[PDB]
Design a protein around this ligand. Structure first.
Ligand code: OIN
Length: 121
C-alpha cells in the first residue's frame, strides 16, 4: 500500500515520502510523461513501470508484509499481487537510497509543463 511504501522510504532514506518523494520531478508521486530529471526521478519512472506490469493489482491499497534480515528487505509471502507489489516497492526504496547523493530539492513540486514526451517502459 502507499502508506507502507512511505514507511519503507523513510526507513531506507531518512526522508519523509511526503514531501520528499510525493511531487519530485516528472515521475515521483504522480507519474506520466517527460524525460526523468535525474537518477531519483528515474527510480520513480521504473517504479511506475513496475506497477504498470500489474494491471489487475491495486498497489495503492493492497497491503503486503516484509521483514529486515540485517538491513535487507525480505518480502514475505502473501497473494501474488502482494508479492509483486512488495518487490516493486523494495526496488524503489533501494533505488532512492542509492541515489541520495544526487537528490535535489529544486525538483520538489516540479511543474507539469516541464515534463513532455513519452518514454517507453
Ligand atoms: C498503483 N497506481 C498506479 C496508478 C496510480 C498508482 C501509482 C502508479 O505510479 C506511481 O507510483 C506514482 C508515483 O511515482 C503515483 C502517481 C499518482 C498517485 C500515486 C502514485 C501506478
Amino acid at each position: 500500500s502507499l502508506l507502507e511504501f512511505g514507511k519503507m522510504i523513510l526507513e531506507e532514506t531518512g526522508k519523509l515520502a511526503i514531501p520528499s518523494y510525493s511531487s519530485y520531478g516528472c515521475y515521483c508521486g504522480w507519474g506520466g510523461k517527460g524525460t526523468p530529471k535525474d537518477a531519483t526521478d528515474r527510480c520513480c519512472f521504473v517504479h511506475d513501470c513496475c506497477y504498470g506490469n500489474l494491471p489487475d493489482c491495486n498497489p495503492k491499497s493492497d497491503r503486503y508484509k516484509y521483514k529486515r534480515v540485517n538491513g535487507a528487505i525480505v518480502c514475505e509471502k502473501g497473494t501474488s499481487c502482494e508479492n509483486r507489489i512488495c518487490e516493486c516497492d523494495k526496488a524503489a526504496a533501494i533505488c532512492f537510497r542509492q541515489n541520495l547523493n544526487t537528490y535535489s530539492k529544486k525538483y520538489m513540486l516540479y511543474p507539469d509543463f516541464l515534463c513532455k514526451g513519452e518514454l517507453k517502459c
